[model samples]
Target: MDSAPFELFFMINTSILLIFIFIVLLIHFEGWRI
Candidate 1:
């Protein structure tokens, strides 16, 4: 099975999801300054 493309997609999605979660947590803990 060719999973190279899927692996790349998964990595990108993981990074994006982490960043999204971090941003949400930051806003949740700190006031929205921006």
Candidate 2:
């Protein structure tokens, strides 16, 4: 397997993970109240 695909996958997964974490924290802390 080539490292190029792995790198792309890692970037996408990281982005998704970060977005999920951000949303979860926002929901728990009442982010929309502003």
Candidate 3:
């Protein structure tokens, strides 16, 4: 059962975006120091 290329691409891109947002939020909260 092989997955479609577009499906693979979308999965990888989504993972990367989630990770990017997570890191950005981490830095933002740490920097703001509420």
* lDDT string, candidate 1, 1-34, tens digits: 9999999999999999999999899997798765
Give candidate 1 misplaced runs (Cα > 4 Å).
26-34
TM-score to native of every candidate shown? 0.54, 0.53, 0.53
lDDT tens per residue, model 3, 1-34? 7679989899999999999999889988989666
Candidate achieving the largest lDDT: 1
Clashing pairs in 2: none
lDDT of each: 0.94, 0.89, 0.90
- lDDT of predicted model 1: 0.94
Per-model clash counts, in order, read 0, 0, 0
Worst 10 residues of 2 by lDDT: 25-34
**Against the true structure, candidate 3 has what lDDT?**
0.90
For 7-27, candidate 2 gives per-residue lDDT tens digits of 999999999999999988888
Residue pairs with clashing backbones, model 3: none
